[PDB]
Amino acid sequence: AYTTFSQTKNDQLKEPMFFGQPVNVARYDQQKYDIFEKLIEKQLSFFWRPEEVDVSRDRIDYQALPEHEKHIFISNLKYQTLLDSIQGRSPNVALLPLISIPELETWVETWAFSETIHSRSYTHIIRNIVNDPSVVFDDIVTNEQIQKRAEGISSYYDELIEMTSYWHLLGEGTHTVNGKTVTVSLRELKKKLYLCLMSVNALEAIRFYVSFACSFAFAERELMEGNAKIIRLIARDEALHLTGTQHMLNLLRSGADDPEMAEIAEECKQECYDLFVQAAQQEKDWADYLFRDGSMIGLNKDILCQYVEYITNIRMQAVGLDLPFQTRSNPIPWINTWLVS
Amino acid sequence: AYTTFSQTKNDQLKEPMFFGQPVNVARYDQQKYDIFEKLIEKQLSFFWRPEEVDVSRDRIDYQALPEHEKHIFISNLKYQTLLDSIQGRSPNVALLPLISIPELETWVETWAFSETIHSRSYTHIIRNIVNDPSVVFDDIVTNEQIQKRAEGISSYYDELIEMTSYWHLLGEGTHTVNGKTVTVSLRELKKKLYLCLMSVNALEAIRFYVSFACSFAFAERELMEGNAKIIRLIARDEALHLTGTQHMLNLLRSGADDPEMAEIAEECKQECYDLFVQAAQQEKDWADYLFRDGSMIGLNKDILCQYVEYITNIRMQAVGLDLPFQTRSNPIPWINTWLV
Ligand SMILES: [Hg+2]
Ligand SMILES: [Hg+2]
Ligand SMILES: [Hg+2]
Ligand SMILES: [Hg+2]
Ligand SMILES: [Hg+2]
Ligand SMILES: [Hg+2]
Ligand SMILES: [Hg+2]
Ligand SMILES: [Hg+2]
Ligand SMILES: [Hg+2]
Ligand SMILES: [Hg+2]
Ligand SMILES: [Hg+2]
Ligand SMILES: [Hg+2]
Ligand SMILES: [Hg+2]
Ligand SMILES: [Mn+2]
Ligand SMILES: [Mn+2]
Ligand SMILES: [Mn+2]
Ligand SMILES: [Mn+2]
């Protein structure tokens, strides 16, 4: 029931962000929510090319690293690579079929495109630091600890996509498919979208930021500086991406965009809270493992657990959730040097 | 049965372009087909921002045009806006879910993104040459002649998306859905994808080029030069887009990718031919509306018809199809100045 060009003339300023009439004309002279047009403009202004960053000294730095620090560095880079592989395709496959205002549709396609640049930059780094990149890329898919740390991200997107297909094909109701009852509920689909957007917010606003702490701890020691320059550009984009999901989530919960969505958000406040705490716990578990063969220099599992708690509290407060952790000031203020946002 | 991160460690150099295992890791150190990596690199090198193009003199030029020339200019621009609105979202909703090699997945997302830039450029032109952009944008949706010229584009993509959802949800076989028998055939889905790609090839290689000729006819008169700079940048991107679809199609026909696709391309060759003939006739039919209020020196229905036949023959030959039209030299050689 989805269409690439809805033939009904509609007022795009009055449609909800999601589940309304599919967007027909792509226009940018007006918007329901100007934050999305501002984000498109900023992201276009930040366009960068990975190939332009010099990573020629990173190979020697990496080879000089102690084995446990090589492990920390490459494990962290593999996780960044996994997250951006998912983020280049997923916002497009999962959200585009559900968006009903043009500025949000183009923001999603712009956001997803920017993630493909991030994926291209990891290839540029990897190719310049190991003789055979396949060694690194082939360990991402079945790497035990990576799977563990990112567990559940692909499932939230996959479940939302499956439910969306059933809704577009069959519509609301109680259906049968090959002898089994299949219930399609718009309310349940709205809940799946909300929890998925909350997960994306945790992904870009907490999972990536923990990864930036690792990358920039090397930059502080003047090591892996090509990687550092790339991660700096990636973090500048991720700040926009987190800004977009925070606004989506706050507009949905306030009730100003879709009243039903506001009721749904309040109804799963406890679920949302526990999923954020679970994301935090997975990052802690990763840090504990990664810093087992030996803590790095300027970073260790305890400093990293503290940073995870610090940033989780900030991000949860930004979308109206209670704080799960003791409040403290930033345990690694030096990181602000690198987060030019 | 679609997944955003397939858990099987697979050799991406051995998957088919479409219908294999969904791509898991996005890597660019190797490619089954380097042409798509080259296309990503070239499109990225062409990155441009519409708003930076100076269109301040176009408002003066546009208001100075006789009424019928305003009609020709704006009718063409509304069609370009329709096509790019569809092309910004459609490759991502219709093709992305079926791609199984990383270089083609990223090419498709890069290509779709580049179309959103084209749409943004039309907003930049429109808001700067007319007082109420809404009248222009709303007319795109409701305009009977515009929709007539584009008929079949959205429908093809929509049918492909529907069939794809049934395949991902139910898998191959004959099913019972709410008491109706629903057949999901992967071979039929491959045919739908294949013909959708041929239709996209016609869209970027013919329909957009006829629109470029209309735009540039004003630039030849030394008017609407801001629009001309933008259309020049857009045409440079479209050349890459049609290169992409010609290569997808010709690789599928070669038998070097999925062998079933090579069988399909041969078996469905009359349908390929027919959809090009139909698109050409739609572009010709549009002339009656375009020139309803009068034509222009060097731009009228006859000239448009000749150009449609000329470019259609060129594009059909490029993907191995017989030529429907009498061969002719280019009726508007002045367009080469603008296309580079
Ligand atoms: Hg999501
Ligand atoms: Hg999600
Ligand atoms: Hg880390
Ligand atoms: Hg580190
Ligand atoms: Hg929730
Ligand atoms: Hg919530
Ligand atoms: Hg949550
Ligand atoms: Hg912690
Ligand atoms: Hg297509
Ligand atoms: Hg198509
Ligand atoms: Hg023309
Ligand atoms: Hg064919
Ligand atoms: Hg003709
Ligand atoms: Mn990213
Ligand atoms: Mn991101
Ligand atoms: Mn275009
Ligand atoms: Mn195009």
XYZ file of C-alpha atoms and ligand atoms in Angstrom:
698
model
C 0.000 0.000 0.000
C 3.163 2.012 -0.243
C 3.683 4.153 -3.377
C 6.723 6.002 -4.756
C 4.428 8.879 -5.897
C 1.120 9.366 -4.080
C -1.267 10.917 -6.583
C -3.382 12.726 -3.986
C -2.632 16.435 -3.665
C -1.976 16.853 0.065
C -0.782 19.554 2.437
C 2.655 18.321 3.450
C 2.801 20.772 6.387
C -0.126 18.908 8.025
C 1.050 15.320 7.647
C 2.607 13.484 10.656
C 6.304 12.677 10.408
C 5.430 9.010 9.994
C 2.536 6.832 8.790
C 0.791 9.552 6.845
C 0.515 9.788 3.071
C 3.805 8.766 1.358
C 5.716 11.857 0.153
C 4.979 12.786 -3.456
C 6.825 16.002 -4.417
C 10.239 16.646 -2.970
C 10.239 20.435 -2.168
C 12.327 22.378 0.334
C 10.821 25.888 0.326
C 8.742 25.181 3.409
C 8.672 22.652 6.159
C 6.612 21.408 9.026
C 9.776 21.002 11.120
C 12.597 23.150 10.032
C 15.152 21.294 12.110
C 15.292 18.628 9.370
C 16.013 21.170 6.630
C 18.679 22.762 8.903
C 20.258 19.330 9.402
C 20.289 18.612 5.649
C 22.012 21.935 5.051
C 24.598 21.394 7.774
C 25.376 17.860 6.657
C 25.891 18.992 3.049
C 28.161 21.748 4.372
C 30.269 19.126 6.182
C 30.829 16.911 3.095
C 34.337 15.364 3.232
C 36.395 12.810 1.262
C 38.275 10.139 3.230
C 40.843 9.668 0.477
C 41.970 13.240 1.135
C 43.160 12.448 4.641
C 46.763 11.384 4.915
C 47.033 8.076 6.792
C 50.596 7.220 5.649
C 52.121 7.303 9.166
C 49.440 5.180 10.750
C 50.959 1.933 9.492
C 54.218 2.454 11.323
C 52.442 3.621 14.493
C 50.190 0.579 14.483
C 53.062 -1.821 13.982
C 54.977 -0.207 16.863
C 52.001 -0.622 19.221
C 52.175 -3.259 21.952
C 50.079 -6.305 20.918
C 47.297 -5.557 23.446
C 47.051 -1.943 22.158
C 46.898 -3.259 18.550
C 44.028 -5.414 19.769
C 42.252 -2.457 21.373
C 42.651 -0.336 18.255
C 41.535 -2.881 15.662
C 38.679 -4.228 17.764
C 37.332 -0.734 18.196
C 37.688 0.009 14.446
C 35.871 -3.200 13.594
C 32.950 -2.160 15.786
C 32.827 1.322 14.138
C 32.854 -0.440 10.775
C 29.957 -2.734 11.785
C 27.853 0.169 13.111
C 28.292 2.288 9.995
C 27.661 -0.729 7.692
C 24.301 -1.036 9.354
C 23.683 2.718 9.380
C 24.396 3.248 5.731
C 21.500 0.996 4.647
C 19.121 0.823 7.562
C 17.683 4.293 7.895
C 16.772 4.034 4.193
C 15.280 0.531 4.201
C 13.511 0.943 7.587
C 12.400 4.546 7.699
C 11.839 5.752 4.154
C 8.803 3.557 3.593
C 7.173 5.140 6.627
C 7.963 8.857 6.222
C 5.250 11.333 5.268
C 6.925 14.772 5.194
C 9.583 15.717 2.597
C 12.183 17.314 4.812
C 12.377 14.187 6.998
C 12.539 11.938 3.927
C 15.480 13.838 2.491
C 17.140 14.127 5.872
C 17.079 10.335 6.187
C 18.557 9.819 2.728
C 21.241 12.456 3.480
C 22.036 10.956 6.889
C 22.295 7.436 5.382
C 24.525 8.720 2.578
C 26.861 10.336 5.067
C 27.196 6.965 6.808
C 28.430 5.405 3.531
C 31.226 7.960 3.567
C 32.101 6.764 7.051
C 32.238 3.136 5.776
C 34.478 4.274 2.850
C 36.807 5.980 5.398
C 37.240 2.773 7.403
C 38.352 1.039 4.236
C 40.850 3.837 3.638
C 42.237 3.361 7.187
C 42.335 -0.417 7.082
C 44.009 -0.526 3.692
C 46.774 1.690 4.947
C 47.486 -0.137 8.187
C 47.398 -3.924 7.434
C 48.863 -5.814 4.402
C 45.651 -7.717 3.849
C 42.373 -5.917 4.683
C 40.406 -9.142 4.351
C 41.865 -10.274 7.644
C 40.025 -7.413 9.338
C 36.758 -7.348 7.297
C 36.145 -11.087 7.537
C 36.368 -10.997 11.362
C 33.586 -8.497 11.779
C 30.662 -10.708 10.856
C 31.344 -13.602 13.185
C 33.572 -11.872 15.736
C 32.136 -13.136 19.008
C 32.661 -10.034 21.079
C 31.495 -7.656 18.338
C 28.288 -9.655 17.838
C 27.808 -9.416 21.597
C 28.366 -5.679 21.811
C 26.017 -4.889 18.909
C 23.522 -7.536 19.781
C 19.999 -6.489 19.045
C 20.632 -3.555 16.702
C 19.893 -5.423 13.495
C 16.892 -7.114 15.179
C 15.102 -3.837 15.984
C 15.471 -2.674 12.400
C 14.581 -6.123 10.959
C 11.447 -6.435 13.073
C 10.295 -2.929 12.133
C 10.816 -3.725 8.426
C 8.914 -7.008 8.624
C 6.029 -5.405 10.458
C 5.961 -2.550 7.946
C 5.724 -4.975 5.049
C 2.791 -6.745 6.630
C 1.076 -3.376 7.253
C 1.649 -2.165 3.653
C 0.493 -5.449 2.131
C -2.452 -6.432 4.361
C -3.414 -3.375 6.364
C -4.707 -3.426 9.923
C -6.619 -6.462 11.111
C -6.556 -10.172 11.878
C -5.328 -12.091 8.839
C -4.450 -15.645 7.899
C -1.341 -16.808 6.130
C -0.879 -20.513 5.407
C -3.083 -21.629 8.271
C -1.723 -19.170 10.850
C -3.298 -16.006 12.184
C -1.253 -12.837 11.610
C -2.372 -9.775 13.499
C -1.436 -6.356 12.128
C -1.808 -3.426 14.507
C -0.856 0.173 13.617
C -0.417 0.781 17.360
C 2.060 -2.046 17.626
C 3.858 -0.797 14.459
C 4.060 2.741 15.970
C 5.579 1.243 19.118
C 8.152 -0.725 17.006
C 9.117 2.483 15.176
C 9.484 4.426 18.471
C 11.699 1.782 20.112
C 13.753 1.457 16.932
C 14.358 5.276 16.838
C 15.279 5.150 20.585
C 17.793 2.371 19.733
C 19.244 4.429 16.865
C 19.578 7.325 19.253
C 21.525 5.078 21.647
C 23.634 3.804 18.780
C 24.786 7.180 17.499
C 24.717 9.016 20.797
C 26.295 6.432 23.137
C 27.825 3.466 21.222
C 29.722 5.647 18.828
C 30.852 8.077 21.484
C 32.400 5.278 23.567
C 34.226 4.253 20.396
C 35.471 7.844 19.906
C 37.064 7.770 23.391
C 39.232 4.811 22.306
C 40.232 6.336 19.013
C 41.093 9.710 20.479
C 43.052 8.239 23.386
C 45.583 7.209 20.725
C 45.472 10.710 19.164
C 46.349 12.141 22.570
C 49.595 10.148 22.441
C 50.208 11.496 18.913
C 49.600 8.006 17.480
C 47.253 6.859 14.739
C 46.799 10.499 13.747
C 45.365 9.769 10.260
C 42.696 7.652 11.937
C 42.185 10.513 14.410
C 41.496 13.054 11.681
C 38.938 10.719 10.105
C 37.233 9.972 13.404
C 37.083 13.722 14.137
C 35.115 14.212 10.879
C 32.922 11.241 11.666
C 32.099 12.559 15.138
C 31.160 15.944 13.644
C 28.596 14.133 11.456
C 27.360 11.916 14.301
C 26.528 15.053 16.322
C 24.078 15.978 13.571
C 22.710 12.475 13.373
C 21.997 12.352 17.185
C 20.455 15.795 16.892
C 18.027 14.445 14.301
C 16.888 11.412 16.304
C 16.578 13.493 19.512
C 14.231 15.881 17.697
C 12.248 13.009 16.124
C 11.797 11.363 19.551
C 10.947 14.565 21.393
C 8.408 15.592 18.715
C 6.824 12.106 18.930
C 6.597 12.094 22.701
C 5.300 15.596 23.166
C 2.080 14.728 21.337
C 2.416 17.679 18.938
C 2.968 15.410 15.921
C 0.824 12.375 16.592
C -1.218 12.083 19.758
C -1.196 8.319 19.600
C 2.589 8.309 19.454
C 2.697 10.411 22.629
C 0.499 7.863 24.475
C 2.724 5.086 23.200
C 5.935 6.775 24.321
C 4.624 7.215 27.899
C 3.421 3.597 27.901
C 6.869 2.209 27.133
C 8.943 4.528 29.298
C 10.144 1.618 31.465
C 10.950 -0.547 28.431
C 12.908 2.393 26.833
C 14.801 2.987 30.034
C 15.886 -0.637 30.339
C 16.970 -0.849 26.696
C 19.230 2.232 27.264
C 20.718 0.646 30.367
C 21.258 -2.567 28.385
C 23.115 -0.673 25.617
C 25.267 0.918 28.315
C 25.988 -2.471 29.839
C 27.054 -3.946 26.510
C 29.566 -1.136 26.032
C 30.916 -1.724 29.530
C 31.225 -5.460 28.858
C 33.149 -4.712 25.691
C 35.539 -2.318 27.508
C 36.179 -4.949 30.188
C 37.085 -7.526 27.556
C 39.176 -5.226 25.374
C 41.192 -4.049 28.379
C 41.831 -7.551 29.730
C 45.154 -8.292 28.010
C 46.178 -5.026 29.618
C 44.811 -1.536 30.100
C 45.930 0.968 27.497
C 47.668 4.238 28.219
C 45.330 7.006 29.355
C 42.363 4.652 29.208
C 41.264 1.513 31.108
C 38.018 -0.355 31.813
C 37.094 1.745 34.817
C 37.626 5.160 33.176
C 35.643 3.838 30.190
C 32.778 2.523 32.385
C 32.650 5.975 33.967
C 32.496 7.621 30.527
C 29.725 5.308 29.409
C 27.742 6.283 32.486
C 28.388 9.968 32.002
C 27.287 10.071 28.370
C 24.343 7.688 28.930
C 22.940 10.056 31.626
C 23.273 13.058 29.269
C 21.652 11.302 26.319
C 18.810 9.855 28.337
C 18.021 13.238 29.902
C 17.910 14.758 26.406
C 15.008 12.488 25.431
C 13.190 12.750 28.769
C 14.271 9.536 30.465
C 15.323 9.163 34.110
C 19.042 8.987 34.869
C 20.278 5.450 35.652
C 23.677 6.457 36.967
C 25.265 8.556 39.707
C 25.892 12.031 38.294
C 29.544 13.047 37.841
C 31.350 15.485 35.650
C 33.081 14.192 32.522
C 35.782 11.685 33.518
C 37.747 12.416 30.330
C 37.497 16.138 29.562
C 40.455 15.813 27.146
C 38.039 14.236 24.714
C 36.331 17.546 24.129
C 39.459 18.557 22.161
C 38.373 16.053 19.550
C 34.658 16.427 19.638
C 34.337 19.655 17.675
C 30.627 19.778 18.454
C 13.485 -12.636 5.555
C 15.373 -9.484 4.843
C 18.072 -8.537 7.305
C 20.091 -5.376 7.859
C 23.110 -7.357 8.921
C 23.303 -10.926 7.585
C 25.105 -13.213 10.068
C 26.664 -15.602 7.600
C 30.313 -14.958 6.734
C 30.023 -14.841 2.937
C 32.412 -14.159 0.048
C 30.980 -10.965 -1.398
C 32.955 -11.405 -4.659
C 30.792 -14.453 -5.398
C 27.342 -13.150 -4.780
C 25.101 -12.064 -7.716
C 24.359 -8.337 -8.041
C 20.741 -8.973 -6.867
C 18.862 -11.565 -4.844
C 21.830 -13.075 -3.041
C 22.626 -12.700 0.662
C 21.901 -9.130 1.836
C 25.148 -7.219 2.291
C 26.588 -7.300 5.772
C 29.980 -5.477 5.919
C 30.382 -2.407 3.740
C 33.929 -2.637 2.414
C 35.565 -1.003 -0.594
C 38.969 -2.655 -0.806
C 37.762 -5.109 -3.460
C 34.838 -5.353 -5.845
C 33.197 -8.045 -7.972
C 32.593 -5.197 -10.469
C 34.868 -2.237 -10.183
C 32.689 -0.121 -12.473
C 30.381 0.592 -9.486
C 33.304 1.683 -7.291
C 34.419 3.969 -10.149
C 30.923 5.395 -10.401
C 30.826 6.095 -6.606
C 34.204 7.869 -6.855
C 33.138 9.958 -9.847
C 29.791 11.008 -8.337
C 31.546 11.988 -5.104
C 34.026 14.081 -7.181
C 31.091 15.879 -8.740
C 29.479 16.947 -5.402
C 27.793 20.348 -5.818
C 25.538 22.550 -3.684
C 22.576 24.053 -5.547
C 22.096 27.052 -3.309
C 25.507 28.383 -4.234
C 24.484 28.765 -7.849
C 23.584 32.344 -8.607
C 19.989 32.419 -9.931
C 19.348 36.102 -9.244
C 19.140 37.092 -12.924
C 16.826 34.274 -13.803
C 13.873 36.000 -12.122
C 14.397 39.069 -14.358
C 14.824 36.835 -17.416
C 11.780 34.680 -16.575
C 9.353 37.554 -16.034
C 10.579 38.990 -19.368
C 9.622 35.865 -21.319
C 6.411 35.887 -23.370
C 3.658 33.918 -21.629
C 3.975 30.795 -23.790
C 7.745 30.628 -23.245
C 7.069 30.867 -19.482
C 4.678 27.927 -20.006
C 7.286 25.882 -21.873
C 9.984 26.639 -19.298
C 7.838 25.929 -16.233
C 6.101 22.842 -17.669
C 9.546 21.328 -18.373
C 10.848 22.233 -14.945
C 7.752 20.679 -13.217
C 8.440 17.422 -15.081
C 12.136 17.440 -14.032
C 10.925 17.983 -10.452
C 8.513 15.008 -10.718
C 11.171 12.686 -12.082
C 13.796 13.583 -9.448
C 11.227 13.365 -6.623
C 10.641 9.787 -7.704
C 14.345 9.082 -8.302
C 15.449 10.379 -4.904
C 13.472 7.755 -3.010
C 12.866 4.919 -5.435
C 16.304 3.374 -5.941
C 16.556 3.174 -2.136
C 13.113 1.706 -1.498
C 12.967 -0.589 -4.502
C 16.527 -1.648 -5.212
C 18.399 -1.488 -1.925
C 16.479 -4.362 -0.355
C 17.527 -6.687 -3.213
C 21.245 -5.899 -3.567
C 23.867 -8.425 -2.582
C 27.294 -6.817 -3.364
C 28.590 -3.808 -1.379
C 29.848 -1.739 -4.323
C 26.388 -1.785 -5.929
C 24.619 -1.154 -2.605
C 26.657 2.027 -2.004
C 26.363 3.082 -5.631
C 22.594 2.921 -5.360
C 22.563 4.975 -2.142
C 24.983 7.498 -3.681
C 22.953 7.740 -6.879
C 19.664 8.236 -4.904
C 21.338 10.871 -2.739
C 22.531 12.754 -5.836
C 18.890 12.897 -7.039
C 17.830 14.650 -3.771
C 20.410 17.297 -4.635
C 18.717 17.664 -8.033
C 15.363 18.144 -6.268
C 16.917 20.733 -3.945
C 18.203 22.606 -7.045
C 14.644 22.816 -8.483
C 13.417 24.356 -5.222
C 16.271 26.875 -5.499
C 15.259 27.764 -9.046
C 11.502 27.890 -8.397
C 11.585 29.981 -5.214
C 13.721 32.507 -7.082
C 11.681 32.941 -10.227
C 8.067 32.883 -8.975
C 6.151 34.475 -6.119
C 4.263 31.388 -4.874
C 6.264 28.150 -5.324
C 3.291 26.232 -4.008
C 1.302 26.733 -7.160
C 4.118 25.153 -9.158
C 4.640 22.248 -6.707
C 0.958 21.471 -6.258
C 0.418 21.397 -10.009
C 2.994 18.642 -10.381
C 0.757 16.267 -8.480
C -2.536 17.213 -10.110
C -1.423 18.042 -13.628
C -3.071 15.519 -15.942
C -0.601 15.949 -18.811
C 2.422 15.717 -16.556
C 1.129 12.562 -14.904
C 0.262 11.219 -18.376
C 3.825 11.696 -19.573
C 5.182 9.878 -16.459
C 2.546 7.120 -16.317
C 4.013 3.748 -15.523
C 7.134 4.928 -13.665
C 5.788 4.928 -10.121
C 3.584 1.931 -10.928
C 6.566 -0.231 -11.951
C 8.574 0.576 -8.868
C 5.482 0.019 -6.654
C 4.738 -3.390 -8.134
C 8.390 -4.400 -7.634
C 8.292 -3.265 -3.981
C 5.068 -5.221 -3.342
C 6.398 -8.409 -4.900
C 9.626 -8.014 -2.977
C 7.741 -7.689 0.344
C 5.808 -10.887 -0.417
C 9.078 -12.660 -1.233
C 10.906 -11.506 1.910
C 7.875 -12.342 4.095
C 6.732 -15.606 2.610
C 9.510 -16.990 0.517
C 9.019 -18.885 -2.739
C 5.945 -21.002 -3.228
C 2.201 -20.825 -3.556
C 0.530 -19.408 -0.454
C -2.928 -18.771 1.047
C -3.302 -15.180 2.259
C -6.694 -14.273 3.647
C -8.162 -17.075 1.596
C -6.573 -16.018 -1.703
C -3.886 -18.015 -3.468
C -0.746 -15.899 -3.814
C 2.118 -17.146 -5.936
C 5.629 -15.946 -5.064
C 8.019 -16.893 -7.860
C 11.652 -15.747 -7.578
C 11.944 -16.022 -11.366
C 8.991 -13.664 -11.785
C 10.510 -11.296 -9.200
C 13.814 -11.336 -11.125
C 11.880 -10.414 -14.269
C 10.175 -7.515 -12.445
C 13.550 -6.228 -11.202
C 15.098 -6.634 -14.616
C 12.304 -4.722 -16.398
C 12.307 -2.062 -13.630
C 16.022 -1.496 -14.373
C 15.330 -1.233 -18.125
C 12.586 1.294 -17.344
C 14.988 3.327 -15.123
C 17.477 3.238 -17.944
C 14.849 4.744 -20.242
C 13.988 7.318 -17.655
C 17.462 8.642 -17.148
C 18.705 8.183 -20.644
C 15.762 9.484 -22.653
C 13.181 11.300 -20.582
C 15.698 13.431 -18.770
C 17.606 14.233 -21.964
C 14.502 15.515 -23.759
C 13.991 17.782 -20.720
C 17.633 18.972 -20.955
C 17.088 20.002 -24.584
C 14.085 22.142 -23.521
C 16.066 23.780 -20.685
C 19.099 24.500 -22.887
C 17.027 26.012 -25.678
C 16.601 28.976 -23.313
C 20.338 29.070 -22.534
C 21.010 29.278 -26.306
C 18.965 32.521 -26.223
C 21.266 33.714 -23.402
C 18.482 33.521 -20.832
C 17.836 31.491 -17.680
C 21.573 31.016 -17.291
C 21.336 30.154 -13.587
C 18.943 27.324 -14.509
C 21.346 26.393 -17.314
C 24.306 26.082 -14.931
C 22.229 23.823 -12.700
C 20.925 21.686 -15.579
C 24.486 21.331 -16.800
C 25.538 19.969 -13.374
C 22.466 17.703 -13.298
C 23.225 16.321 -16.765
C 26.747 15.511 -15.719
C 25.269 13.404 -12.875
C 22.649 11.785 -15.088
C 25.384 10.610 -17.487
C 26.849 8.657 -14.581
C 23.422 7.314 -13.570
C 22.641 5.974 -17.017
C 26.200 4.535 -17.220
C 25.325 2.645 -14.047
C 22.098 1.158 -15.399
C 23.630 0.318 -18.838
C 26.338 -1.620 -17.006
C 23.954 -3.374 -14.644
C 21.824 -4.432 -17.644
C 24.698 -5.429 -19.891
C 26.432 -7.400 -17.113
C 23.157 -9.280 -16.430
C 22.817 -10.014 -20.191
C 26.440 -11.349 -20.408
C 25.759 -14.410 -18.288
C 28.709 -13.460 -16.062
C 26.486 -12.704 -13.097
C 23.353 -14.663 -12.152
C 22.825 -17.060 -15.083
C 19.065 -16.948 -14.614
C 19.220 -13.170 -15.294
C 20.953 -13.750 -18.625
C 18.092 -16.142 -19.571
C 15.529 -13.556 -18.500
C 17.148 -10.691 -20.409
C 16.959 -12.807 -23.626
C 13.478 -14.091 -22.963
C 12.062 -10.751 -22.029
C 13.804 -8.766 -24.958
C 10.479 -7.848 -26.658
C 9.232 -6.355 -23.371
C 12.500 -4.316 -23.137
C 11.902 -3.077 -26.670
C 8.268 -2.300 -26.004
C 8.875 -0.247 -22.907
C 11.374 1.940 -24.791
C 8.852 2.398 -27.632
C 6.173 3.381 -25.132
C 8.392 5.837 -23.281
C 9.383 7.469 -26.579
C 5.716 7.861 -27.531
C 4.916 9.429 -24.133
C 7.685 12.033 -24.567
C 6.317 12.843 -28.005
C 2.759 13.139 -26.765
C 3.864 15.701 -24.189
C 4.650 18.175 -26.980
C 1.015 18.902 -27.538
C 0.746 20.257 -24.000
C 4.177 21.850 -23.979
C 3.473 23.922 -27.083
C -0.268 24.392 -26.451
C 0.153 28.168 -26.225
C 2.692 28.436 -29.033
C 6.179 27.135 -29.829
C 9.601 28.863 -30.022
C 12.178 29.429 -32.660
C 14.135 26.170 -32.811
C 11.894 24.384 -30.305
C 8.553 22.909 -31.365
C 6.762 19.549 -31.590
C 8.503 18.486 -34.767
C 11.980 19.151 -33.462
C 11.163 17.440 -30.154
C 9.876 14.375 -31.995
C 13.005 14.134 -34.101
C 15.207 14.397 -30.982
C 13.213 11.727 -29.176
C 13.777 9.319 -32.084
C 17.444 10.225 -32.299
C 18.278 9.702 -28.624
C 16.069 6.637 -28.248
C 17.946 4.840 -31.011
C 21.214 5.690 -29.339
C 20.185 4.439 -25.937
C 18.561 1.225 -27.227
C 21.658 0.306 -29.184
C 23.753 0.802 -26.011
C 21.873 -2.035 -24.281
C 21.656 -4.381 -27.285
C 18.149 -3.659 -28.553
C 17.013 -3.306 -32.181
C 16.311 0.251 -33.348
C 12.690 1.287 -33.740
C 13.318 4.536 -35.584
C 14.708 5.625 -38.930
C 18.335 6.615 -38.362
C 18.969 10.360 -38.491
C 21.663 12.852 -37.584
C 21.215 14.897 -34.461
C 18.381 17.446 -35.087
C 19.744 19.789 -32.352
C 23.558 19.676 -32.576
C 23.683 22.804 -30.370
C 22.878 20.641 -27.387
C 26.409 19.222 -27.356
C 27.704 22.607 -26.157
C 25.789 22.053 -22.932
C 26.201 18.347 -22.288
C 29.990 17.954 -22.526
Hg 15.231 2.726 13.499
Hg 16.458 0.461 15.044
Hg 36.740 1.931 23.373
Hg 41.579 2.766 22.807
Hg 9.574 3.000 24.307
Hg 10.121 6.859 26.141
Hg 14.981 3.081 24.616
Hg 29.694 1.423 33.272
Hg 13.987 0.095 -10.940
Hg 11.390 0.906 -12.208
Hg 12.811 19.394 -25.542
Hg 16.374 -6.889 -22.908
Hg 9.644 12.343 -35.492
Mn 28.515 7.020 11.008
Mn 25.630 8.274 12.329
Mn 18.337 13.504 -11.314
Mn 19.364 10.361 -12.373
